[PDB]
Amino acid sequence: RKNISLTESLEEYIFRNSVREPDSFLKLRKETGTLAQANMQISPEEGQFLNILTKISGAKRIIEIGTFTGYSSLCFASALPEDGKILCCDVSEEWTNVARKYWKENGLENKIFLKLGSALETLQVLIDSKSAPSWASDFAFGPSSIDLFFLDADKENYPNYYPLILKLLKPGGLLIADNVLWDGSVADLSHQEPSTVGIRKFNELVYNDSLVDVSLVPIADGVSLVRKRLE
């Protein structure tokens, strides 16, 4: 094995030695745990990973595709510099109502932009925009305008988000892709669900794309670091 075998005990050690979690963030995880799609949200470890990556990258304009109850957006929003901003794309009013509850609790709303609706559409309108739509005014628009992407939406559509992400990203920009291992089902060809297929196709596109570099990190359910190359 290339990677350490994790145990419960070792995961608790990791938590106790890396995770410094605000009570409001913990509050959100507990609230989300009540919901059926509770496991749809990231670990606080993954949160911290996104946090450090945002800082390391120097990102000032982020787009999150798939927001849910808002944990990751909370991590991005607090990691951004005071002049840094994030656009969140989600189909759900209900869940992003929970997200905003926590954005407000943490005083981060000023940094955060929300566009409800289909993300394929939200991204295309942003690409084609000549001036900024009201919801992206003072954020960004047009191709090569984004520093960092977080992809965590509907999995079957991952290969369709990819070209749009790549067009919106500045050269040197970063795509962070969630769920790239899909509980290990990606490696098992008996699994042919639309979500599993989308993720496999996405991983394949990224791997064979000479315009990017990839690091597939076995954190959480797999996290791909996909950097758009210069020129």
Ligand X SMILES: Nc1ncnc2c1ncn2[C@@H]1O[C@H](CSCC[C@H](N)C(=O)O)[C@@H](O)[C@H]1O
Residues forming contacts to ligand X in the complex (CB under 6 A) are: 40-42, 65-69, 71-72, 89-92, 95, 118-119, 152-154
| C-beta closer to ligand X: residue 76 or 141 | 76
Cα 8 → chain centroid: 26
**Site string (17-56) toward its own copies, x via CB under 8 A:** xx-x----------------------x-xx-xx-xxx-xx
Find the binding residues for its own copies in span 149-208 (CB under 8 A).
172, 174, 181, 183-184, 186-188, 203-204, 206-207
From the CB of residue 171, how many other CB atoms can be counted at a distance below 10 Å?
A: 11
CA atoms within 13 A on the CB side of 11: 10
Q: Under DSSP, is residue 89 helix (H, G, I), strand (E, B) or coil? A: strand
Binding-site positions for S-adenosyl-L-homocysteine read: 72, 90, 119, 154
Among 34, 36, 215, 231, binds its own copies (CB under 8 A): 215
Alpha helix locations (H) across the chain? 8-16, 23-33, 44-57, 71-79, 93-105, 119-128, 158-168, 194-208
Tell me which residue of 122, 105, 100, 87 sits closest to 24, measured CA to CA.
105
**Binds 92, which of ligand X, its own copies, none (CB < 5 to 8 A, cut-off by type)?**
ligand X
- What is the C-alpha separation between 61 and 51, in angstroms, rounded? 14
- What is the C-alpha separation between 123 and 77, in angstroms, rounded? 20
Q: Decide if residue 231 touches its own copies (CB under 8 A).
A: no
Total site size for its own copies, rule CB under 8 A = 56
Find the binding residues for its own copies in span 54-73 (CB under 8 A).
55-58
| C-beta closer to its own copies: residue 129 or 185 | 185
| C-beta closer to its own copies: residue 18 or 144 | 18
Exposed / middle / buried, residue 135 (Cβ in 10 Å: 0-12, 13-18, 19+): middle
Q: Interface with its own copies by CB under 8 A: which residues?
A: 1-18, 20, 43, 45-46, 48-49, 51-53, 55-58, 172, 174, 181, 183-184, 186-188, 203-204, 206-207, 213-222, 224-225, 227
